[PDB]
Amino acid sequence: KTTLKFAAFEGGYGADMYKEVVAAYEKLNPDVKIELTTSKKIEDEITPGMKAGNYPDIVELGQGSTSGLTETLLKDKAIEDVTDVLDMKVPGENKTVKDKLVDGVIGLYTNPYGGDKTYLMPMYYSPSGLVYNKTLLEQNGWKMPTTWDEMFKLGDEAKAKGISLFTYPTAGYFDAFFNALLADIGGDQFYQDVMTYKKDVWKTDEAKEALETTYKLVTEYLNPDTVGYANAQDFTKNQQSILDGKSLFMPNGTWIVNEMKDAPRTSGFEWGFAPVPTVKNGGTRYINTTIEAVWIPAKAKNKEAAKKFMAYLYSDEAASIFAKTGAIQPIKGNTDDLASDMKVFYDAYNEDNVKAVAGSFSATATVEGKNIKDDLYNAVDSVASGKTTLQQWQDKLNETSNALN
Numbered sequence: 001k002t003t004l005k006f007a008a009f010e011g012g013y014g015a016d017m018y019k020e021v022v023a024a025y026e027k028l029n030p031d032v033k034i035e036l037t038t039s040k041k042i043e044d045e046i047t048p049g050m051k052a053g054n055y056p057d058i059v060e061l062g063q064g065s066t067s068g069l070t071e072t073l074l075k076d077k078a079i080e081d082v083t084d085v086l087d088m089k090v091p092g093e094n095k096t097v098k099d100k101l102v103d104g105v106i107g108l109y110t111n112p113y114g115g116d117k118t119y120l121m122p123m124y125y126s127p128s129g130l131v132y133n134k135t136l137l138e139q140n141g142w143k144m145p146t147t148w149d150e151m152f153k154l155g156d157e158a159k160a161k162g163i164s165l166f167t168y169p170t171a172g173y174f175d176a177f178f179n180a181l182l183a184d185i186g187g188d189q190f191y192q193d194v195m196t197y198k199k200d201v202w203k204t205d206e207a208k209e210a211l212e213t214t215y216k217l218v219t220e221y222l223n224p225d226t227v228g229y230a231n232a233q234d235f236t237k238n239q240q241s242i243l244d245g246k247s248l249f250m251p252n253g254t255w256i257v258n259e260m261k262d263a264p265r266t267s268g269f270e271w272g273f274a275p276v277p278t279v280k281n282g283g284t285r286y287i288n289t290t291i292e293a294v295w296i297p298a299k300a301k302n303k304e305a306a307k308k309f310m311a312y313l314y315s316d317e318a319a320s321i322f323a324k325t326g327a328i329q330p331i332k333g334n335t336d337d338l339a340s341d342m343k344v345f346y347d348a349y350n351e352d353n354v355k356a357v358a359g360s361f362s363a364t365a366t367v368e369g370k371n372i373k374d375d376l377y378n379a380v381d382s383v384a385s386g387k388t389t390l391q392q393w394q395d396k397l398n399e400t401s402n403a404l405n
């Protein structure tokens with residue numbers, strides 16, 4: 001009887017799970033009719049200056065997406081404060097959302113302006129690191145590196161066999177890669193300092209080491225097809241080079257299994273997963289806990305109905321639907337009895353001297369014509385193409401970060 005408009009990003013876990021969650025919510029609450037739109041081009045729904053009666057009431061779209069829409073609306077103060085959803089009862093259950101969320105998931109990603117106001121409620125719960133064909137490493141006697149010195153020496157051996165060390169799907173996937181590498185090199189406070197624009201942080205030895213390591217990786221050890229395919233249309237072709245045996249490693253998360261399930265692959269292929277290597281031998285390695293986001297536009301017409309549906313995304317019923325393709329909602333218990341195809345990913349948290357990192361950049365400050373994510377992540381394409389030097393990369397980051405500070 002009351003219509004709610006829900007726009008959801010169609011990513012590697014698939015669109016059908018959202019159709020099924022919506023149907024389950026309507027069975028629980030028959031007086032709600034949800035109009036669901038799923039698409040790889042969500043930005044079509046929410047356009048600048050749109051009329052309030054035409055906005056979606058609720059949107060699933062993480063930070064880091066192709067369009068950058070979530071960050072654009074944060075900059076414009078155009079996303080509703082949904083802190084109150086944390087204290088709402090989950091529909092169909094006798095617990096609140098906060099009762100169910102895993103500890104520590106609320107943080108700089110979900111609370112982008114700092115402080116205790118939540119604007120991006122967390123979706124999924126994917127370790128990110130490096131994926132590879134475990135069988136290919138085994139066939140060659142290659143051990144998974146824990147250091148970049150080992151990685152580069154492995155790249156030297158792999159090239160002799162016609163294999164490039166590294167590819168990436170798009171440059172945006174350096175979000176999780178740098179969260180891990182920065183924490184590896186500098187520690188927890190250093191990572192926080194980068195995300196919050198501490199003065200001169202990109203001129204530290206720690207930050208320079210992160211960039212120098214990544215510069216060498218993408219200028220000496222990159223599959224030559226990577227940059228040309230590193231876009232929303234062709235990213236799966238870069239991923240296909242792992243399945244075809246032409247690249248060894250790429251940064252990714254657990255949606256890669258479902259996303260590539262129908263693709264051809266080399267005989268005996270099996271997914272491997274590891275943390276990003278660190279620099280010092282025996283050093284702590286971090287796994288990034290990658291989440292997407294669900295949120296309510298400030299111009300939404302039906303915010304209260306959207307908040308109740310949002311709370312239902314943390315129900316056991318919803319979690320069971322999402323888990324069929326590997327999408328693991330960030331609620332307690334949801335990694336007990338994991339599907340067998342997820343074991344290789346979540347087992348990485350059990351390696352010795354491995355820790356978790358998570359987050360994104362603070363959205364408190366904005367500067368005209370500057371975007372720190374373009375300067376850190378998107379710049380990798382230019383670096384790999386030989387159009388940005390290592391010094392230019394660092395200098396532009398320090399300039400933008402200091403201006404945001």
Ligand SMILES: CC(=O)N[C@@H]1[C@@H](O[C@@H]2O[C@H](CO)[C@H](O)[C@H](O)[C@H]2O)[C@@H](O)[C@@H](CO)O[C@@H]1O
Nearest residue numbers: 011012013064065066172173175176235255
């Ligand atoms: C190209 C694309 O849309 N990929 C989807 C993923 O989105 C990427 O996520 C990574 C995470 O490290 C990074 O933020 C990229 O910039 C972003 O494009 C992701 O949404 C997954 C799972 O839903 O689906 C696609 O693979």
Ligand code: NA
Nearest residue numbers: 334336337338
């Ligand atoms: Na489970």
